[PDB]
């Protein structure tokens, strides 16, 4: 199947704190495997998955030394951004970054990524061609022009097509699973009415769809749900409910769609 690696990086300035806090999280296939945090006693990249422990000291020392450069890079960029937007001192500001690569089932590069957000909103991003930049804000054109004259896109294209891909292969090999949902329906009175709640439990990954049908067509209005949420053990949960006349429990059918199933599940309230 397809694979991916991601690095999510954050720099936070606060009202008085003197210098920003820097956090970098690495993901392989949308699961965390390394983390760096400038708040820690001895700030370093630390393994966050058991399969990462097989890397030796000079791997972690090289990653950590890069995270210290990033920390400075974000500090200077937070300072420049303050002036681009004519923001005064004494506020809280955030800088964010997502970078990484997507691989197909053949382990070849599908797409690279490099995006930035200031104050949680899109600031500048590398286009799919890995050659040109998109920057919407007027304050962001200053950065787009600097990065075009310096040719920064070439540096990131080389990283995304080379190191991002090859180190992901190494991570994939060393770490080379989905959990299918278990579903059930519950019964709750509403005098003269009843709600049926279709549960989905223990599934991984998080993407899932729950539908209800009235002996035929889907129910889009009338459908109460919750956003998919982590159980805390690595799996996820979700439910969807509909209000139903008390004698019509069996004219309603829950469907569960998940990438780990042979086919969608089909289930009703069974007393």
């Amino acid at each position: 199947g397809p694979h991916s690696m991601r690095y999510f990086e954050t720099a936070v300035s606060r009202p008085g704190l003197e210098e920003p806090r820097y956090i970098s999280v690495g993901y392989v296939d949308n699961k965390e495997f390394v983390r760096f945090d400038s708040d820690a006693e001895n700030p370093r990249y630390e393994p966050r998955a058991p399969w990462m422990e097989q890397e030796g000291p000079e791997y972690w020392e090289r990653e950590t030394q890069k995270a210290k450069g990033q920390e400075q890079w974000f500090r200077v960029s937070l300072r420049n951004l303050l002036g681009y937007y004519n923001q005064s001192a004494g506020g809280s500001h955030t800088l964010q970054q997502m970078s990484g690569c997507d691989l197909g089932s053949d382990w070849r590069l599908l797409r690279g990524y490099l995006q930035f957000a200031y104050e949680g909103r899109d600031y500048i991003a590398l286009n799919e061609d890995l050659k040109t930049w998109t920057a919407a804000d007027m304050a962001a054109q200053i950065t787009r022009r600097k990065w075009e004259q310096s040719g920064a896109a070439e540096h990131y294209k080389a990283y995304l097509e080379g190191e991002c891909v090859e180190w992901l292969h190494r991570y994939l090999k060393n770490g080379n699973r989905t959990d299918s949902p278990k579903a059930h329906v519950t019964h709750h009175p509403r005098k003269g009415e009843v709600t049926l709640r279709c549960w989905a439990l223990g599934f991984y990954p998080a993407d899932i769809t729950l539908t209800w049908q009235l002996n035929g067509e889907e129910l889009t209005q009338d459908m109460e749900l919750v956003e998919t949420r982590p159980a805390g053990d690595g799996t996820f949960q979700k439910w969807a409910s509909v209000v139903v006349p008390l004698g019509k429990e069996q004219n309603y059918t829950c469907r569960v769609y998940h990438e780990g199933l042979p086919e969608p599940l089909t289930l009703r309230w069974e007393p």
């Binding site: 690095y7 970098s24 690495g26 390394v34 990249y45 990653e63 890069k66 995270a67 450069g69 990033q70 890079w73 200077v76 960029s77 420049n80 951004l81 970078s99 490099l114 930035f116 600031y123 500048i124 950065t143 600097k146 990065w147 310096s150 920064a152 540096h155 990131y156 990283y159 190191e163 991002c164 180190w167």
Partner: peptide, 9 residues
């Protein structure tokens, strides 16, 4: 393998 930024914003 984490990235290394070049020019600052």
């Amino acid at each position: 393998m984490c990235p290394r930024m070049t020019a600052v914003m």
